[PDB]
Amino acid sequence: VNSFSGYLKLTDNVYIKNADIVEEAKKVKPTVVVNAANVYLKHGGGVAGALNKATNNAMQVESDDYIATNGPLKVGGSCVLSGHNLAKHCLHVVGPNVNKGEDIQLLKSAYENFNQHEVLLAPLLSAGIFGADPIHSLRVCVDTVRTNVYLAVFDKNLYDKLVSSFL
Ligand SMILES: Nc1nc2ccc(F)cc2s1
User: Fold this and answer.
1) Macro domain: which residues?
2) 111 CB less than 6 Å from ligand 1?
3) Torsion angle of alpha carbons 86, 83, 95, 123, nearest 10°?
4) What's the Cα-to-Cα distance from 165 to each of 67, 68, 160, rounded to whole Å?
5) Ligand 1: which residue has its CA nearest to atom 10?
6) 159 CB within 6 A, ligand 1
7) For the CA of 36, the nearest atom of ligand 1
8) Among 89, 118, 81, which residue's Cα sits nearest to residue 29?
9) Is the minimum distance from the CB of 15 to ligand 1 under 6 angstroms?
10) Which of 47, 129, 138 best tests ligand 1's pocket when mutated (most atoms within 8 Å of CB)?
């Protein structure tokens, strides 16, 4: 048993809810929250901007030190950093950004990072301002992630379309 509440069960391991991931993280304090990161860990907008704002910019300060030491992530890659006030850990995962012309085949590689963690609170990778079709992102998630993933979908309209179209 875990602390996640109000989720619809899609599969053995994937759950979904219409929820702001910031507010969900603040309530649950999960072991792992996933950020929709870019390779520079520049948390300007979308999920990343909202998570970083909720940490009072501490996520960005930590991220800048990480990049100064290690250089940029790979598209499809990830790093584990602090979860600050939101979670124990933040798994920063880089899905491909369609609005930059990145290979959508890298979305499966991105979701494979989730398998290193038994339970995660996450957004749909490459959705929102990353430009991919969220229906596709949910299909790749279900077909790739084997650990227990609690997906927060911010937009109520999109949530209802994801559920009602799910095979
Ligand atoms: N407070 C929140 N802002 C965003 C922005 C984008 C998003 F996909 C999810 C959320 S939750």
Assistant:
1) 1-167
2) no
3) -20
4) 39, 43, 8
5) 47
6) no
7) 8
8) 89
9) no
10) 47
Instruction: Specify which residues 120 forms β-bridges with.
Output: 149
* Residues 46/142/79/155 CA torsion (nearest 10 deg): 10
Helix (H, G, I), strand (E, B) or coil at 159: helix
Resolved by: X-ray
The residue nearest atom 11 of ligand 1, judged by CA position, is 20
- Where is 136: in which H helix or E strand? helix 134-144
- 154 DSSP 8-state letter: -
Count the residues in the chain: 167
89-93 and 78-82: which strand pairing? Answer: antiparallel
Supply the DSSP string of 41-72, one letter for each residue.
Answer: ----SHHHHHHHHHTTTHHHHHHHHHHHHH-P
Residue 62 Cβ contacting ligand 1 at under 6 Å: no
**Residue 25, amino acid:** A
Strand order of the sheet with strand 14-18? 8-9, 14-18, 148-153, 119-122, 32-36, 89-93, 78-82
Ligand 1 centroid to Cα of residue 105, in Å, is 24
- Å from CA of 119 to ligand 1 middle: 20
Helices and strands counted in the chain (H then E): 6, 7
Is residue 123 in contact with ligand 1, taking CB distance under 6 Å? Answer: yes
3-state SS, residue 33: strand
